Amino acid sequence: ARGLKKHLKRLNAPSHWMLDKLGGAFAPKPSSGPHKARECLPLILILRNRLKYALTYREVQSILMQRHIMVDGKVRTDKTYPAGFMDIISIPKTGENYRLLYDTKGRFRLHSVRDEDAKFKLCKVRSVQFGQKGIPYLNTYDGRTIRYPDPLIKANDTIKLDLETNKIVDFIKFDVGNVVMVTGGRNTGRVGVIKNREKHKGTFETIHVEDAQGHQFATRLGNVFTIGKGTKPWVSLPKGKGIKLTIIEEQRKRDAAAQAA
Amino acid sequence: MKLNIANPTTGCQKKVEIDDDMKLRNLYDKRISQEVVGDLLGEEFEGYIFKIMGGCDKQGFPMKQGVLTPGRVRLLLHRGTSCFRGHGRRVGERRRKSVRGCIVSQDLSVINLVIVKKGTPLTLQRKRARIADKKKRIAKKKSEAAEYQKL
Amino acid sequence: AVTLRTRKFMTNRLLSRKQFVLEVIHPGRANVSKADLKERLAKIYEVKDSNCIFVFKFRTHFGGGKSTGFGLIYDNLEAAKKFEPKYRLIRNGLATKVEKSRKQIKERKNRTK
RNA sequence: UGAUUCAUGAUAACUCGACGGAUCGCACGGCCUUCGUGCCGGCGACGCAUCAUUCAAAUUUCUGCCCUAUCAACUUUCGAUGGUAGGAUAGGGGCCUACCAUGGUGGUGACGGGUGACGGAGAAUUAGGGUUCGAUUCCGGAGAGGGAGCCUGAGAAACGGCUAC
RNA sequence: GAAACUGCGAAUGGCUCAUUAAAUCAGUUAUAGUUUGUUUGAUGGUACGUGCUACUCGGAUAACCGUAGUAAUUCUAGAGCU
Ligand SMILES: [Mg+2]
Ligand SMILES: [Mg+2]
Ligand SMILES: [Mg+2]
Ligand SMILES: [Mg+2]
Ligand SMILES: [Mg+2]
Ligand SMILES: [Mg+2]
Ligand SMILES: [Mg+2]
Ligand SMILES: [Mg+2]
Ligand SMILES: [Mg+2]
């Protein structure tokens, strides 16, 4: 075309937004923001479709310009804000925190947290390298940038960012043997401990992972997101501890659910 | 032909009509922004200095400064400027309008001439608020740069 | 001799309302008016104001005798004023309506000044 | 970084410097230095420039398209294939110029011709293989009666903008 | 509070399939060969002063008033304010 496309029709809206086919022609079209707009979830889909705090477009507009909604600790009036992975949504009117996490099927869940496990967020680093006058800085995948980074922090690593001092508090060196939570592809959602990492000259370096209950898979370096050093993650995993289970087992669990009821 | 008379000194304006050759042989052949003495424009304009400035004609197409030919030539103008103030025209548009030349001549209608000669506390807050946060910026530097320097 | 029950009920003190999907059962009865449901909902929630209720989207399932729909109970009529779509207010008569004729709603009027 | 005279620093200068805030809101509130709206200082808006990011685009690499040989030679003075030097562009580039070289393609179908041919996801029929279709609501392209040229703008060779035929 | 000036958008949507057969397009590449309003995050010395902690506040302009051309139309000239 001759310029930016600003409508997104409903059937082009990515698969993991779960929004139905016949509810209308268009879809919220996330604004250019901190997350890649293909790996995101707008605030309207958060309020209206999942939490049902509103029932229309305008009602979410009312919610947002009441100034009720918070993202990464600062109030947000936008209504197609591209929230993403481990963005925290607080609603101080309800004293209630969500941290936006995948499940094993590739869809977003709102995993609740307390305040001590909400004061900080967690994100990986895109790259660390120099800037003006030779000061190092790093750029995350969250858009965030940090100046004077801890000279050990490298690319592909992960960091915790407090929402008051607004700098590092710790960083996990991307390495073999610590757990990840893949965020793209068919394996997205599945947590698990790296067992190997193979690099190829000129293209993507892949990571082999194992679900702590045995199953093993692989994914290129793009979608891995180390959570915690070792086996223990530094974030409260969702209802199913990041294990994708065969459809047969999803049948057995529902049989076992009904046979005790 | 028909004269518009206005004065900036008082602020008053009015219009009359003249039809005398020997009265307007001196009116012809003159451009925009040229003084004319009212001596010969009529015996009751003596001392009054009239300024030929403006002037449109029948068919309503004005005279423009700078185009010197008693024709009705088509020019490509810019909105808002002399002899083109088209509204609702999507700034940056140009149109090829019709204009008269700048030397007055026979075929005009109405000639315009003018008369030259008649014979806080909030700011006080904001300035230093700016000074305050610009200086805390540099204090924050002299903390957070050396914090990293010592390592 | 009709019944009245709710489900899918959630209170959001964001928009200061209690919102539910009611599941009315009126065997024998043709159907129940929304007005006629107002006093029953008001006297079972003691909302102190039978005008804070706004109920809609009634169906009367195939075969008759059971109707569903949505319901909205506000806690201050102030919030009912502000967080409401313009037409449920008009349905309850809390405000009135006007009509349009759009020849020079804006078009001819974009020409003069 | 797979790989860079990379990121970046320092230095010598250069520029008639775009830039480095003469902008706008409520909330009042600690305390006299001349008790002087007094010393103050917060929460916001708007905005200017660099970097990163995001929404994009543009250019781009490999492979993939129907019938036709009664379409076996096509391109090359005037860019056709390449080299250098340069201009132009946001940028690579024969995109253009100067000079030099004579190359590029072709029976694995070039070039040309036909298409009642926009491409695709897909539609019908289907035992398997296939045959035919695809204007159409999703994506990509193209176009505003036919062409051509432009201003405003981050973005238009825009037509619910202009200029000419 | 209308009107108007300044800002932004009108380059999205929408319709159609005329053009176009390695071309558009599809899968997949690339940018170390580039531009990107904005959103989000970070960032901001010296303007001259002989670098010895900054040295002062401009009219003209729409809307409005008034006076006109033209047959004319978001066609148009001039005076007067801000
Ligand atoms: Mg379009
Ligand atoms: Mg949007
Ligand atoms: Mg070159
Ligand atoms: Mg055709
Ligand atoms: Mg289309
Ligand atoms: Mg037609
Ligand atoms: Mg076009
Ligand atoms: Mg055009
Ligand atoms: Mg039209």
Q: In the structure encoding, which two tokens stand for residue B127, read together? A: 């300035």
Task: Give the Cα separation of B114 and B4 in Å (integer).
Answer: 8
Picking from C17, C12, C9, C38, the residue whose alpha carbon sits closest to that of residue C82 is: C17
CA distance A214 to C111: 75
* DSSP state letter for A45: I
Q: Is the CB of A34 under 7 A from strand E?
A: yes
Residue B82 class from Cβ within 10 Å (0-12 exposed, 13-18 middle, 19+ buried)?
middle
**DSSP 8-state assignment for residue B61:** P
- Which element (helix H / strand E) includes A96? strand A96-102
- Distance in angstroms (rounded) separating the CA atoms of residues A26 and A13: 8
Q: Which nucleotide minimizes the distance between its C1' and the CA of A6?
A: E12
Share in percent of chain A as helix, strand, coil (round to 5): 15, 30, 55
Chain E bases closer than 7 angstroms to a protein Cβ: 3-5, 7, 9-14, 30, 37-45, 54, 63-64, 66-81
Residues 6+ apart with CB under 8 A from A113: A88, A97, A98, A99, A236
Cβ separation of C13 and A94 shorter than 8 Å?
A: yes
Triad B104, B106, B109: Cα angle to 5°: 80
Residue A58 three-state SS: helix
Minimal Cβ distance to A53: which of C12, C70, C85: C12
- CA B92 to C1' D165 (Å) is 23
CA gap A104, A243 in Å, rounded = 6
> Chain A residue with minimal CA distance to C71?
A55
Q: C26: distance to nearest CA of chain A, Å?
A: 27
The kind and range of the H/E element at C19 are strand C17-22
Which helix H or strand E contains B3, and what residues bound it?
A: strand B2-6
Experimental method: cryo-EM
Which tokens hold the place of B15? 């219009």
d(CA B23, CA B40): 6
Strand partners, A168: A161
- Exposed/middle/buried for residue B58 (C-beta within 10 Å: 0-12, 13-18, 19+): exposed
Asked if strand D contacts A206 at the CB level, meaning under 7 A, the answer is: no
Resolution (A): 3.4
What dihedral do alpha carbons A228, A231, A236, A240 form, nearest 10°?
130
Token pair recorded at residue B81: 């400027």
Nearest residue to C60 (alpha-carbon basis) of C20, C24, C8, C21: C24
B144 and A148 within 8 Å at the Cβ level: the answer is yes
Question: What is the tally of helices (H) and strands (E) in chain B?
Answer: 3, 8
Counting one residue from chain A and one from chain B, the pairs whose CB atoms sit within 8 A come to 5
Alpha-carbon distance A190 to A105, whole Å? 8
Maximum distance among all Cα pairs of chain B, rounded to whole angstroms = 98
A223: alpha, beta or left? (left if phi > 0; alpha if psi -120 to 50): alpha
CA angle A102/A203/A181 to nearest 5° reads 15
Does the CB of A36 sit below 7 A from strand D? yes
For residue B120 the two structure tokens come to: 């806080």
Q: How far apart are CA C10 and CA C72, in angstroms?
A: 10
For nucleotide D158, the protein residue with its alpha carbon nearest to C1' is A2
Whole-angstrom Cα distance, residue A147 to residue A131?
9
A38 touches strand D (CB under 7 A): yes
Amino acid present at A182: V
d(CA A198, CA A176): 11
Amino acid of residue A153:
I
Quick one: CA dihedral B8, B12, B14, B19, positive or negative? Answer: negative
Secondary element (H or E) of residue A109: strand A108-113
Positive or negative, the CA dihedral B84, B90, B95, B98 is negative
